[PDB]
Symmetry: C3
Subunit: 148 residues, 3 copies
Amino acid sequence: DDQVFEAVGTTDELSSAIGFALELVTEKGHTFAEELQKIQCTLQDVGSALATFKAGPILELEQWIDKYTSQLPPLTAFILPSGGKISSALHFCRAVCRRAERRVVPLVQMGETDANVAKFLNRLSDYLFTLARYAAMKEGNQEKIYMK
Amino acid sequence: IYTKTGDKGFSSTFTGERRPKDDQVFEAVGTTDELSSAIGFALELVTHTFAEELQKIQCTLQDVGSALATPCSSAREAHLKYTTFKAGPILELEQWIDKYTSQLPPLTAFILPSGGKISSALHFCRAVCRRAERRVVPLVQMGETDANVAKFLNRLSDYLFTLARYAAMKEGNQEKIYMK
Amino acid sequence: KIYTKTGDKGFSSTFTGERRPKDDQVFEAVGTTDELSSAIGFALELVTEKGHTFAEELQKIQCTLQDVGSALATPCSSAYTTFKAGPILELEQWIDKYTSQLPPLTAFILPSGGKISSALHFCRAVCRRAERRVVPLVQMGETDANVAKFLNRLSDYLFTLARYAAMKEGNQEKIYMK
Ligand SMILES: Nc1ncnc2c1ncn2[C@@H]1O[C@H](COP(=O)(O)OP(=O)(O)OP(=O)(O)O)[C@@H](O)[C@H]1O
Ligand SMILES: Nc1ncnc2c1ncn2[C@@H]1O[C@H](COP(=O)(O)OP(=O)(O)OP(=O)(O)O)[C@@H](O)[C@H]1O
Ligand SMILES: [Cl-]
Ligand SMILES: [Mg+2]
Ligand SMILES: [Mg+2]
Ligand SMILES: [Mg+2]
Ligand SMILES: [Mg+2]
């Protein structure tokens, strides 16, 4: 099936975009770098699952999200993809992650893939978005804002 | 785990339709966000008027996104500002291109993606932009999206191409030329 | 003036002169191929030192990617378009060169290994996307099988070159962990 190869490929594409973003991290021992690396592993499991996906990593993502949200101001503006190297790269990862989601979706719904793979990808773009903001905040960057 | 509205693989348009995330509309808005993000990263390599231009373009790509997520077949009276995509930013890209073009050597051979970090990031952006044009086109040719969105993305890749060239020249980088 | 506006309505030309909508699978394959060449272009900028022979290789590969573009823009039924085996066989030689210098590998390598190596894993993914786009074209007999072969062998090249970059830099690449 072509749809499976497409979904696996786009998952790998995401993981490799994360791989490149990780290279932008200049200081050693950041916990989000650990997290991104764990996600990459999960993406490999996504890969073979597509080709039973437990809920744990979704929960993991949800607690990391909540951790970073509580450290950040409320979200009042619409931001443009920005805020420093890592941040921008994560915004790109977010876009690619959302593309992966769209590719997995028909596979679920056809019941060829565990529902949770979609949920994980859905939640991953929230993680990547949140992490981007968190990363920019910690560089004290200030992201660019929408203007007509 | 949370029960998020997107978890069963459906999302919403700005007109209230529920569609599988699979849908053309989301392929089209996703790919546009992808493009804007790529530009976001390219901006981070600015080492500048053209940096200002790239941001305005990101802002237009927001509008593009609002437009794509508002199918004309179901736009009502209050959504008219989203369904209406004015020509202005296109004329802008055109006059920007003329400006840069009048500062560049004449062009006759095929340029490979190259020219320094900013220039190469821009060539990648251009490629992503043309993918975004491919996603928008079927919405336009189905009457769901203003044709001006497509004009824009069409022109944008020529803008992004000529800026790449400009950046290369202002760094003293010669781009590679197609060989054989 | 570089823009004609003639594609402003969503249509464009194949190298046969046929007008098609821009979302036609021919354009999807050509574009994805451009995307790949652009990704290689960026990875090329991550090379610090002068005179790396792989850097010369990737640039030759960009040239072939243009040829792959043209071939794809010239679908066979509507025409006469053959893609020669040469750049494939050449890729195969370069692959052996790097492959033979590498540790035997039993792990699963996560996209990692430094900037170059990382950029090249991404390139590999985009190349694999380009393969997936070329596949329908070959199966309906619009494109020479060799074109798919080239991108396939190029996926292999980019993976193993990323391993090579990582090893030269002495940059440990990350492994799959359960
Ligand atoms: N995978 C996707 N690709 C492109 N666009 C999307 C995708 N998912 C959602 N969208 C669009 O972007 C908007 C914001 O995305 P969001 O992720 O918040 O929606 P969702 O996935 O339906 O909701 P939730 O993430 O809260 O479950 C959505 O209303 C939808 O129009
Ligand atoms: N968005 C696209 N994605 C992939 N391939 C394209 C795209 N647009 C055009 N092509 C192909 O690449 C060639 C050069 O593209 P170009 O953008 O100059 O064409 P166009 O959009 O038809 O014309 P113009 O841009 O001058 O209005 C075209 O002749 C066509 O074969
Ligand atoms: Cl795609
Ligand atoms: Mg979502
Ligand atoms: Mg949301
Ligand atoms: Mg064009
Ligand atoms: Mg042109």
